[PDB]
Amino acid sequence: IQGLLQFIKEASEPIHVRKYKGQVVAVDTYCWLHKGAIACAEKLAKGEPTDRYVGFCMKFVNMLLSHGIKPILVFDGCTLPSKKEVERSRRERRQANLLKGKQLLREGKVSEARECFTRSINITHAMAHKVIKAARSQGVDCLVAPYEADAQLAYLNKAGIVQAIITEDSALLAFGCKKVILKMDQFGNGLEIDQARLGMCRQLGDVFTEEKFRYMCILSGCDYLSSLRGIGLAKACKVLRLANNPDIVKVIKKIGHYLKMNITVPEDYINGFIRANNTFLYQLVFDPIKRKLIPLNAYEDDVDPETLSYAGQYVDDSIALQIALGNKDINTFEQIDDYNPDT
DNA sequence: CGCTAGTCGACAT
DNA sequence: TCGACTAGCG
Ligand SMILES: [Mg+2]
Ligand SMILES: [Mg+2]
Ligand SMILES: [Mg+2]
Ligand code: NA
């Protein structure tokens, strides 16, 4: 969600991680991976061996461990079919910046070339696994999500397994997270947002419940569904405030009326909205206790799970376990490690 | 004002 | 993995 943090900044508190001393905090590790990969973009683009991002993550991990924090590193897994568009686009951008960067290396211009290399960064599962080994070497629990780390984190937080989530993506709130810590530096200073405190935001109105908030985020334009032309956070929120009807479908079919604008709503956009909603609600996560694949939320009676392939497809529990442990590479689907949490 | 969408940014010498 | 910033539209 573009500009979500600025939109709900009144619900944020400048905190320090000491607040969660002795408690358990889950981490959106790919953020630290993207931050760490920039320091060595040149060598990553050229294919030269590098492991600085590992130590970069380990600074943060050790920082948490020093304050008595019990961290759980969560990593992005398989690509979600309901997100293939964004992945494809970002991939194209990466390739383009890579090519232009190489050409700029041929020109001798190193500044611009580096400026492209830093934008052509691609976080693989191999790097992530380097981080995993490095972390497990110091007794830090690591877990690969079946798909997006967002949903997995949301589950870990809702299940009571973790009490807070360290990330740079505020849109995690739309998944149903209770507490989210943003912009955390290497010392432990960050910005916390509580779900219950969403009432602090005046411009939200009565749109602070999970359902309405989720609707707002989707309508604003997310990674699952592009917003209608001229529709952002404020206007979607306005729609949800002015809307009295619970059935969101008719509301969206009356969005032109609610905003006093001439909006044409394609029939496919409704299906896309249902898809995005069901994706936010029932995206497959991995229960670490029972060791099995479950949706983020228990299925309702108004949904047929067979049509929810875009929210991720089920696999055997053993395979899901081996992926979650990081022993199985996402793309090759072959064993790359043989870790066992039992012995 | 508020949406777009491009730009620029994240590291670290 | 993503947000901050802004010129420009309505
Ligand atoms: Mg990826
Ligand atoms: Mg994510
Ligand atoms: Mg996200
Ligand atoms: Na939008």
DSSP per residue, A173-201: GGGT-SEEEES--SSSEEEEEESGGGGG-
Q: Do residue A184 and residue A51 come from a single domain?
A: yes
A43 and A53 Cβ atoms separated by less than 8 Å: no
Residues 6+ away with beta carbon under 8 Å from A128: A29, A30, A33, A75, A76, A144, A326
Structure tokens at A168: 């740079």
Q: Do residue A104 and residue A239 come from a single domain?
A: no
Examine the fold and report which residue of A241, A258, A283 is the final residue of a domain before the chain moves on. A283
Q: Do residue A3 and residue A151 come from a single domain?
A: yes
The protein residue nearest B12 (Cα–C1') is A39
Q: Do residue A262 and residue A337 come from a single domain?
A: no
Outline where chain A has alpha helix (H). 4-7, 29-37, 41-46, 52-66, 84-107, 110-117, 125-136, 149-158, 210-220, 233-242, 248-252, 255-258, 267-282, 317-324
Examine the fold and report which residue of A170, A205, A240 is the final residue of a domain before the chain moves on. A205
Residues 6+ away with beta carbon under 8 Å from A299: A282, A305
Q: Do residue A271 and residue A294 come from a single domain?
A: no
The reply to whether A4 has its C-beta less than 7 Å from any atom of strand C is yes
Q: Do residue A113 and residue A178 come from a single domain?
A: yes
CATH of the domain at A265: 1.10.150.20
A273 and A225 Cβ atoms separated by less than 8 Å: yes
Q: Do residue A181 and residue A212 come from a single domain?
A: no
The protein residue nearest C5 (Cα–C1') is A3
Q: Do residue A143 and residue A231 come from a single domain?
A: no
Q: Do residue A120 and residue A190 come from a single domain?
A: yes
The reply to whether A92 has its C-beta less than 7 Å from any atom of strand C is no
Q: Do residue A142 and residue A277 come from a single domain?
A: no
Examine the fold and report which residue of A178, A205, A232 is the final residue of a domain before the chain moves on. A205
Number of folded domains in chain A?
3
Structure tokens at A303: 């949904």
Q: What experimental approach yielded this model? A: X-ray
CA of A170 to C1' of C4 (A): 14
Nucleotide whose C1' lies closest to the alpha carbon of residue A39: B11
Experimental structure resolution, Å: 2.8
Expressed as residue numbers, the domain containing A305 is: 284-343
The residues pairing with A13 across neighbouring beta strands, listed in sequence order, are: A192
Q: Do residue A182 and residue A288 come from a single domain?
A: no
State how far the alpha carbon of A246 is from the alpha carbons of A3, A162, A227, A278, in Å.
26, 32, 20, 17
CATH of the domain at A56: 3.40.50.1010
The reply to whether A193 has its C-beta less than 7 Å from any atom of strand C is no
